[PDB]
Design an enzyme around this catalytic site. Sequence first.
Site, PDB file in Angstrom:
ATOM      1  N   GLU A 186      16.302  14.484  10.189  1.00 26.87           N
ATOM      2  CA  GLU A 186      17.330  14.281   9.489  1.00 26.87           C
ATOM      3  C   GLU A 186      17.696  15.125   8.453  1.00 26.87           C
ATOM      4  O   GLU A 186      16.901  15.544   7.682  1.00 26.87           O
ATOM      5  CB  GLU A 186      17.202  12.937   8.807  1.00 26.87           C
ATOM      6  CG  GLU A 186      18.446  12.494   8.007  1.00 26.87           C
ATOM      7  CD  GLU A 186      17.931  10.785   7.387  1.00 26.87           C
ATOM      8  OE1 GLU A 186      17.089  10.749   6.751  1.00 26.87           O
ATOM      9  OE2 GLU A 186      18.974   9.983   7.682  1.00 26.87           O
ATOM     10  N   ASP A 241      23.035  13.174   8.321  1.00 26.96           N
ATOM     11  CA  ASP A 241      23.033  12.073   7.365  1.00 26.96           C
ATOM     12  C   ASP A 241      24.183  12.410   6.430  1.00 26.96           C
ATOM     13  O   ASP A 241      24.266  13.283   5.467  1.00 26.96           O
ATOM     14  CB  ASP A 241      21.568  12.197   6.387  1.00 26.96           C
ATOM     15  CG  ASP A 241      21.549  10.741   5.647  1.00 26.96           C
ATOM     16  OD1 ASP A 241      22.358   9.811   5.691  1.00 26.96           O
ATOM     17  OD2 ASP A 241      21.088  10.890   4.511  1.00 26.96           O
ATOM     18  N   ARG A 294      22.227 -27.261  14.755  1.00 27.71           N
ATOM     19  CA  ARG A 294      22.699 -26.301  13.491  1.00 27.71           C
ATOM     20  C   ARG A 294      21.798 -25.022  13.770  1.00 27.71           C
ATOM     21  O   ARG A 294      22.524 -23.959  13.578  1.00 27.71           O
ATOM     22  CB  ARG A 294      22.590 -26.836  12.225  1.00 27.71           C
ATOM     23  CG  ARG A 294      22.958 -25.933  11.149  1.00 27.71           C
ATOM     24  CD  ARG A 294      24.149 -25.241  11.407  1.00 27.71           C
ATOM     25  NE  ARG A 294      25.111 -26.071  11.687  1.00 27.71           N
ATOM     26  CZ  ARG A 294      26.592 -25.948  12.353  1.00 27.71           C
ATOM     27  NH1 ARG A 294      26.922 -24.679  12.648  1.00 27.71           N
ATOM     28  NH2 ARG A 294      27.321 -26.813  12.732  1.00 27.71           N
ATOM     29  N   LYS A 319      12.505  11.512   7.616  1.00 31.51           N
ATOM     30  CA  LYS A 319      13.663  11.282   7.003  1.00 31.51           C
ATOM     31  C   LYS A 319      13.787  12.326   5.442  1.00 31.51           C
ATOM     32  O   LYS A 319      12.792  12.982   5.278  1.00 31.51           O
ATOM     33  CB  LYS A 319      13.575  10.005   6.362  1.00 31.51           C
ATOM     34  CG  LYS A 319      13.512   8.858   7.732  1.00 31.51           C
ATOM     35  CD  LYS A 319      14.743   8.094   7.845  1.00 31.51           C
ATOM     36  CE  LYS A 319      14.342   7.169   9.003  1.00 31.51           C
ATOM     37  NZ  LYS A 319      15.653   6.367   9.198  1.00 31.51           N
ATOM     38  N   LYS A 354      17.383  -1.224  10.104  1.00 33.34           N
ATOM     39  CA  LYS A 354      18.103  -2.026   9.101  1.00 33.34           C
ATOM     40  C   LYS A 354      18.430  -3.472   9.794  1.00 33.34           C
ATOM     41  O   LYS A 354      19.550  -3.797   9.767  1.00 33.34           O
ATOM     42  CB  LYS A 354      18.993  -1.395   8.584  1.00 33.34           C
ATOM     43  CG  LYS A 354      18.708   0.025   8.197  1.00 33.34           C
ATOM     44  CD  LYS A 354      20.106   0.527   7.349  1.00 33.34           C
ATOM     45  CE  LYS A 354      19.545   2.058   6.824  1.00 33.34           C
ATOM     46  NZ  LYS A 354      20.765   2.865   6.477  1.00 33.34           N
TER      47      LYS A 354
HETATM   48  O1  LIG Z   1      13.882   3.725   4.889  1.00 34.58           O
HETATM   49  C1  LIG Z   1      13.600   4.205   6.320  1.00 34.58           C
HETATM   50  O2  LIG Z   1      12.528   4.116   6.741  1.00 34.58           O
HETATM   51  C2  LIG Z   1      14.885   4.575   6.969  1.00 34.58           C
HETATM   52  C3  LIG Z   1      15.998   4.255   5.886  1.00 34.58           C
HETATM   53  C4  LIG Z   1      17.252   5.246   6.399  1.00 34.58           C
HETATM   54  C5  LIG Z   1      17.962   5.687   5.127  1.00 34.58           C
HETATM   55  C6  LIG Z   1      18.865   4.570   4.333  1.00 34.58           C
HETATM   56  O3  LIG Z   1      18.472   4.057   3.479  1.00 34.58           O
HETATM   57  O4  LIG Z   1      20.019   4.581   4.344  1.00 34.58           O
END
Ligand SMILES: O=C(O)CCCCC(=O)O
Lengths: 297, 294
Positions: free
Chosen positions: B210, B231, B114, B181, B149
Amino acid sequence: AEAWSPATDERLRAAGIDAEDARRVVVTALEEDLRYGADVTSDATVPADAVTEAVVASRQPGVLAGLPVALAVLDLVTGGRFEVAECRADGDRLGPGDVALRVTAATRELLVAERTMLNLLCHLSGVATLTARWNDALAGTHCKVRDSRKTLPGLRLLEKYAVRRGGGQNHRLGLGDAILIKDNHIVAGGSAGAALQAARAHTPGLPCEVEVTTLAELDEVLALGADEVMLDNFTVEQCVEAVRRRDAARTRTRLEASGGLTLDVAAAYARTGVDLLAVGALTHSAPALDLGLDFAP
Amino acid sequence: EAWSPATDERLRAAGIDAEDARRVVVTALEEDLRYGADVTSDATVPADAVTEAVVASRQPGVLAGLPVALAVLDLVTGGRFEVAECRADGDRLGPGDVALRVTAATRELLVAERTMLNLLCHLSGVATLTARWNDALAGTHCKVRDSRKTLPGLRLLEKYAVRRGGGQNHRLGLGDAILIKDNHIVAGGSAGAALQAARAHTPGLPCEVEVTTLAELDEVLALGADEVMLDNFTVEQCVEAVRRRDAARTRTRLEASGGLTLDVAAAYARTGVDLLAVGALTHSAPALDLGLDF
Ligand SMILES: O=C(O)CCCCC(=O)O
Ligand SMILES: [Cl-]
Ligand SMILES: [Cl-]
Ligand SMILES: [Cl-]
């Protein structure tokens, strides 16, 4: 930053989260993000003394799970230097735009914590959200949905927790805490009855379930008064027959359907009168719930 | 709790980080064994029993994780297993295709299986979804990439699986590249100011920035940004973005992301952008249905 505060341990245990396992997951995850060096982007663009308010908000409808673990991440990153203004509870239903957490902390530390916090929240909320969809498909019956050992490596206890937060029930946690006889065990043992009797004798104190693939195997374990039988890849009509034989044996064996199940047939199976559905996809194929962390403007 | 040299060699030949893979495998086995022995098999399976076993796909997809699954079996058996047949990570499989044929003690296969399959089905699921994104981008110059992610503890294996599915990796973590970001810009108040501060601080590190609006795009194109992430731009805004990038005559690479799904993948690939960044490759990949049959 070596271990978080006892207040965080208490919040994890208050929630029913295994705190030592959650610490391993969190410390490992932060390590994956920080092993190449410090957060260069934030260190170049954000002052060391900046503090900000941040909101964790859902972009999709679903069920929240893992918020105490995300707070443990922030607790660890900040050394306890954060303040919560608002928080929802794991198990709460969220719609788009709903705020699950509002926190204040040093801006650089939120930027380090953010992605680990969200990777945990989004996955566990995705598990609880999918589980709730299965549970809702069972409304009007007494049927319940259960999970499996088809969890993602290293995330078993957290995903089992998320399944509970979505209204599901946990199946066994490992190989040693309960018996589940399957086809390889039936082949080896000589018959379904022989494997059931061998398991009962070898460990009489453990929960015992036997998985069958045919109605003939089912008759054997009903004749031996099995407590719980997993019906492996039965059609809906075979479940009706299985339930009919169960009701006539008057042993009141629990029946658990498994294999070949999708959300669009879940209500049909529950209507046959089986007591449980065992669903691997709850943990191995749960799409993440889309939550984001947004700084105050 | 150490595996054989043959396994270290296998993992290295595949480009798999062996210390990370050891942590994942040992942790996963402990999850299954911390409550005691395999009581079901101990009651029903002879201790001397030996069997051949086949890992086969029930669905079409791309294989990934096979050297890690073999490391699981190596650990559990202490090296007492025979491989008769194996496919390679990145091979395309159809239903019934055999990925692996092994012989080992039956009780040890029942303990190992498993964990082997949880790893194999997850990583092949990542590679399989990546390959579908790649197929939607065929006929264009647009490529698909993953993100941070990732599921906690599974980052390096999941990034490996994206490469086996034909995708690109970008940043492995926070420290190895600059990506400005939205939250950085909120904290600073200006997208162009953030870019210039990042550029100044470490002149040789490539900056990606971004943006969420076409006005922000104008601002960073004017400063000659090398790479821009769009974005949550719509398909039409990406076409417009490509136009402004071409008009500004910069060499700025354009990347799109934000809730991208497969049913719009092929349309976004025809906007002119260079890359699509897809979180779903790692946080929402359905498992590939692989089974182990004695
Ligand atoms: O949190 C980060 O460091 C990148 C996140 C990218 C933005 C999202 O939450 O969609
Ligand atoms: Cl509970
Ligand atoms: Cl149980
Ligand atoms: Cl490679």
